[PDB]
């Protein structure tokens with residue numbers, strides 16, 4: 001029937017051609033010359049001539065030549081429970097979250113502080129260094145499939161950057177947040193009203209809408225941003241602490257925020273919360289809060305996580321004006 005090498009060659013070539021189709025048509029940004037693409041396409045068709053078994057309706061060469069890229073928001077499973085975080089709006093609410101941690105975890109706590117972005121939660125699963133799937137939060141177990149749209153974001157790399165320091169992991173799930181910069185938010189709104197479309201009330205809604213598009217070409221045009229702030233199921237990584245895990249993401253080419261600091265005790269946490277209270281509007285995107293998490297992975301595990309929220313993290317949300 002088909003030889004092992006026959007199938008290997010075909011899948012390899014189909015995948016390469018399929019991907020270039022995505023960049024040229026969907027993202028409108030090809031990474032190879034058109035002439036080269038023509039070479040690849042011919043070879044694919046040649047192979048399909050050679051072997052008619054492989055010719056299928058889903059093949060790049062036959063029945064999806066023009067365009068077969070759509071997003072149907074199919075439910076997809078998250079590798080790890082991705083739960084929403086508990087919120088803390090007062091210093092007093094802080095306090096319980098502060099002491100309780102010290103009761104269970106003890107004195108070797110070391111809380112990580114990160115700015116809280118107000119956009120849409122996005123989960124990426126980056127198997128063998130390739131982006132296999134992007135999905136929304138949903139109910140925490142399963143979410144909608146917006147992989148195609150996630151591939152168009154400038155900030156989201158398709159492939160991980162290999163290096164000796166941080167070897168590319170096997171199966172890697174990295175959570176993050178998609179958002180718009182204030183300037184771009186206004187810009188997109190202007191473009192929208194220019195073409196008769198209704199503008200968005202805020203950047204959160206604007207980003208959510210721009211991501212949730214049935215046709216990913218639409219999302220490719222908008223300047224969505226991304227910042228990775230969490231790790232889901234990871235294989236072959238074993239990052240000791242959360243902050244150390246961030247170096248890994250950095251080495252792999254993933255977007256990370258530059259306003260993350262480590263606070264040894266509650267007092268350090270309070271400073272950051274206070275500081276970002278006066279300076280949070282200086283940032284180019286919407287920051288509604290400060291996120292505090294126990295940095296040590298091993299310690300985190302002990303504290304565990306409740307039915308719908310982690311016990312090792314809490315988000316301080318600044319009061320609305």
Ligand SMILES: NC(=O)c1ccc[n+]([C@@H]2O[C@H](COP(=O)(O)O)[C@@H](O)[C@H]2O)c1
Nearest residue numbers: 020021023024030031032033034037038
């Ligand atoms: N630069 C790329 O990655 C890439 C990918 C797919 C198609 N293409 C070009 O798209 C064009 C579509 O028009 P034709 O149907 O006349 O080929 C082709 O000429 C092909 O070279 C370019």
